Amino acid sequence: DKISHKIDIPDSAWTIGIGEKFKNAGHPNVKYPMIDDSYVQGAPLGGFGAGTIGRTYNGGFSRWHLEIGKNKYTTVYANQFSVFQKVEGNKDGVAQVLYAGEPENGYLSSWKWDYPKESGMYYALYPNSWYTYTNKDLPVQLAVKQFSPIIPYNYKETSYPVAVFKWTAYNPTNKNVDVSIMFTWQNMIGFFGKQVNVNSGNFNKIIKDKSKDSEIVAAVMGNISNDNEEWNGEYSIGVKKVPGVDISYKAKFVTTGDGSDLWHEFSKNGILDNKDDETPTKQDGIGSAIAVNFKLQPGQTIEVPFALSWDLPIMKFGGGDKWYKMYTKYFGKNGKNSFAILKEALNNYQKWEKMIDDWQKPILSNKSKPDWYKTALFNELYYLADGGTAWENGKVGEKRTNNMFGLLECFDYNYYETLDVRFYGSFPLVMLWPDIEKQVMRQFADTINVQDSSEFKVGSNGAMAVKKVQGMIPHDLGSSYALPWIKINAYDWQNPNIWKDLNSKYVLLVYRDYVLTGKTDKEFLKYTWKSVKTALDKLKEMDKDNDGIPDNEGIPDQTYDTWSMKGTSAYCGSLWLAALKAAQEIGKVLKDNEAYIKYNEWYKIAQQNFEKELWNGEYYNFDTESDHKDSIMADQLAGQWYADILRLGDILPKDHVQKALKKIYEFNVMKFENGKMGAVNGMRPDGIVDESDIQAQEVWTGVTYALASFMKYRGMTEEAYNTAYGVYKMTYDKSGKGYWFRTPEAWTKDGNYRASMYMRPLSIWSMEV
Numbered sequence: 071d072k073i074s075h076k077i078d079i080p081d082s083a084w085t086i087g088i089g090e091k092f093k094n095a096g097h098p099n100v101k102y103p104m105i106d107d108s109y110v111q112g113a114p115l116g117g118f119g120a121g122t123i124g125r126t127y128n129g130g131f132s133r134w135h136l137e138i139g140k141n142k143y144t145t146v147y148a149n150q151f152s153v154f155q156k157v158e159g160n161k162d163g164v165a166q167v168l169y170a171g172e173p174e175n176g177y178l179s180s181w182k183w184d185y186p187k188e189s190g191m192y193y194a195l196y197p198n199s200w201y202t203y204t205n206k207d208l209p210v211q212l213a214v215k216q217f218s219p220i221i222p223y224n225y226k227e228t229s230y231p232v233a234v235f236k237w238t239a240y241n242p243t244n245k246n247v248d249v250s251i252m253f254t255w256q257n258m259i260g261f262f263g264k265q266v267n268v269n270s271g272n273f274n275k276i277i278k279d280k281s282k283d284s285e286i287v288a289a290v291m292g293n294i295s296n297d298n299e300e301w302n303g304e305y306s307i308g309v310k311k312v313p314g315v316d317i318s319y320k321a322k323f324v325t326t327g328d329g330s331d332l333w334h335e336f337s338k339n340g341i342l343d344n345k346d347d348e349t350p351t352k353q354d355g356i357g358s359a360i361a362v363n364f365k366l367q368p369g370q371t372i373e374v375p376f377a378l379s380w381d382l383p384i385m386k387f388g389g390g391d392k393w394y395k396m397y398t399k400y401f402g403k404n405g406k407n408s409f410a411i412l413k414e415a416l417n418n419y420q421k422w423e424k425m426i427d428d429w430q431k432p433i434l435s436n437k438s439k440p441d442w443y444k445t446a447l448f449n450e451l452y453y454l455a456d457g458g459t460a461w462e463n464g465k466v467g468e469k470r471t472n473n474m475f476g477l478l479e480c481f482d483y484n485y486y487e488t489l490d491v492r493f494y495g496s497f498p499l500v501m502l503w504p505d506i507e508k509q510v511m512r513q514f515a516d517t518i519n520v521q522d523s524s525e526f527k528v529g530s531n532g533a534m535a536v537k538k539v540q541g542m543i544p545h546d547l548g549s550s551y552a553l554p555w556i557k558i559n560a561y562d563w564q565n566p567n568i569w570k571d572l573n574s575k576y577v578l579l580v581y582r583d584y585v586l587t588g589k590t591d592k593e594f595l596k597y598t599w600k601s602v603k604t605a606l607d608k609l610k611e612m613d614k615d616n617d618g619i620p621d622n623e624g625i626p627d628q629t630y631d632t633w634s635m636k637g638t639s640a641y642c643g644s645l646w647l648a649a650l651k652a653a654q655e656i657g658k659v660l661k662d663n664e665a666y667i668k669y670n671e672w673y674k675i676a677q678q679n680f681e682k683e684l685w686n687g688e689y690y691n692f693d694t695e696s697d698h699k700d701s702i703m704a705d706q707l708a709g710q711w712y713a714d715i716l717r718l719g720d721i722l723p724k725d726h727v728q729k730a731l732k733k734i735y736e737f738n739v740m741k742f743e744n745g746k747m748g749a750v751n752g753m754r755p756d757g758i759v760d761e762s763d764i765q766a767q768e769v770w771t772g773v774t775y776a777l778a779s780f781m782k783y784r785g786m787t788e789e790a791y792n793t794a795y796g797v798y799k800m801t802y803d804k805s806g807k808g809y810w811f812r813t814p815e816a817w818t819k820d821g822n823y824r825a826s827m828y829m830r831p832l833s834i835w836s837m838e839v
């Protein structure tokens with residue numbers, strides 16, 4: 071490996087060998103079908119709301135999130151980079167697809183598949199990833215850096231449906247070597263969203279953009295239809311000329327054939343036919359190829375950038391609504407703009423690299439933090455793009471000031487912005503994209519007094535319940551299978567209108583968003599104030615014994631949606647205390663004296679009774695009325711965790727908080743698989759895991775990272791990082807279960823999981839407050 075020194079990969083990048091088999095992989099531990107796409111994954115490409123494409127560590131374009139809200143795992147085999155090399159003096163060269171695998175059927179059988187093992191590495195530090203190719207039959211060593219311009223405090227480039235592939239080639243040998251790099255792509259119009267005739271009318275064209283000191287050559291893969299529909303648009307691949315390289319291309323090869331129409335050209339001398347051909351296809355799948363060829367002398371390095379764009383302007387949801395995607399603000403809505411997007415990337419990628427370096431540098435340059443922590447901190451952010459992210463720039467046929475946004479809970483539970491989860495998972499948005507975060511919270515504010523009296527069947531018990539109650543915050547803002555932003559509370563396993571955490575978490579999120587953006591946004595507090603007061607006032611009505619605290623009802627009426635709480639719970643009780651303190655402070659800021667007084671009065675009574683009912687001398691009891699009320703809950707003081715972040719001070723005595731945190735580390739962490747797997751949710755005082763429900767026996771990745779944050783703020787530095795390390799290990803390490811780029815909600819002691827690709831573990835960013 072002589073190529074590593076010619077590029078700059080951070081030591082904290084996650085690494086794996088190209089073609090590596092992983093032996094320890096976890097699988098779902100639930101009874102009904104659940105997504106398991108395997109451990110062959112990678113860091114995604116694509117901006118927020120753009121649709122994303124997961125290119126795996128084996129080189130394949132395999133995890134398709136281009137249909138917004140859906141996860142489709144299938145390798146499109148025509149989509150590849152390939153290499154040709156010939157040493158000066160030899161009669162033949164060699165050609166090789168850079169993919170550690172082969173197609174299942176006979177399509178593209180002429181291509182040279184099965185990139186060999188132990189011949190290259192994959193590296194990832196989101197939004198960047200890299201491959202190196204160090205192969206005994208490839209004298210010239212190659213590397214690529216791939217990325218999309220995902221940039222904090224930037225709402226423009228961050229939305230773009232584009233990826234850059236910056237290649238570096240170096241000749242460590244003593245002979246001249248001719249080298250070609252080829253990018254192939256299938257015309258994927260019709261891959262989704264088209265009910266019949268899926269390739270019909272697809273056609274490819276070549277764009278040559280020549281202007282002084284610039285030549286770009288690109289293929290634009292579109293359809294002859296000018297219809298404005300979810301399925302229609304364009305893909306483009308292309309390359310920018312640099313000194314010492316020539317460009318060749320092939321506009322049309324057949325993907326549903328043996329591929330020799332292309333490969334016979336590339337494998338001979340690494341140079342394509344430059345054949346333009348705009349003939350549309352009928353049944354056959356078609357693709358395009360863009361290549362560069364150059365000669366490298368001994369010791370010579372060259373850099374060449376390729377790019378990929380996709381202009382699919384319209385997203386359609388299952389309930390029928392069609393919306394334009396955010397990037398259309400910058401490039402247009404007609405779906406004929408892929409080249410413009412590609413060109414912007416090829417002409418500005420060096421600037422984008424620097425912008426990414428500039429935001430990663432403060433963390434990467436901090437030598438007090440271990441590299442493993444940096445690996446997790448950056449790579450967990452994959453989910454902001456990969457989470458079915460929807461970001462609208464108008465309803466088709468409809469202009470407003472704001473652009474609505476939604477991140478999925480996950481794909482198995484296809485709900486936008488699940489609020490009990492975003493309480494944990496939204497830290498990166500408030501910290502890095504706060505205008506999105508505040509927009510999402512205003513979306514929730516607007517729903518507070520919505521009332522939908524139609525009824526739905528509650529999954530857990532079969533009872534009928536009202537869809538949406540006035541004054542109750544919704545669980546979620548809908549499903550991609552239905553109508554995001556329009557039809558809320560798609561979730562139906564429990565009735566969220568009686569949940570005891572949503573209204574308090576809503577208030578805490580509002581105040582968090584004010585505090586963590588500088589305590590300056592009075593306008594945001596003003597916008598949300600009526601909803602805050604309404605939310606707390608409605609929750610107070612659920613106090614059934616006048617102890618000043620809402621009563622959990624002996625069912626799962628909060629985020630642990632199969633784990634029953636009854637009476638005053640540590641979890642919901644502490645959230646309530648903190649929400650009351652937050653509302654007091656908002657009242658002060660807004661000069662609402664009567665609100666300050668009322669919430670102060672409720673706070674003092676509730677605080678006294680919380681302490682009386684639950685403090686047992688060592689920790690706070692799970693609740694006051696359950697069968698295992700004395701279980702040690704990992705999340706027992708979630709309200710105090712948020713109070714620390716919001717700078718609301720002590721809601722409970724410092725000494726008792728410290729004892730409780732120490733107890734949690736001693737038990738829920740250290741007595742669970744020797745503290746190497748995170749914090750199990752519920753542990754009995756005898757040090758055996760609580761078996762009352764499956765959720766008690768689960769480690770929740772987002773709960774554990776948030777607990778680590780809590781410990782860290784409280785000066786329990788070793789405990790904090792040790793607790794978080796188990797989550798990192800299970801997700802990324804060779805000794806873990808292979809969950810990189812699909813961090814799940816939960817695992818059990820055997821390491822098997824529930825709900826991969828989950829929002830909650832984005833809470834690792836609470837460790838950076």
Ligand SMILES: OC[C@@H]1[C@@H](O)[C@H](O)[C@@H](O)c2[nH]cc[n+]21
Nearest residue numbers: 483488490561629630631815
């Ligand atoms: O894992 C627990 C989570 C809950 O916290 C969410 O509120 C809910 O939408 C849901 N559905 C399935 C699983 N879950």
Ligand SMILES: [Ca+2]
Nearest residue numbers: 613617619621
């Ligand atoms: Ca009560």
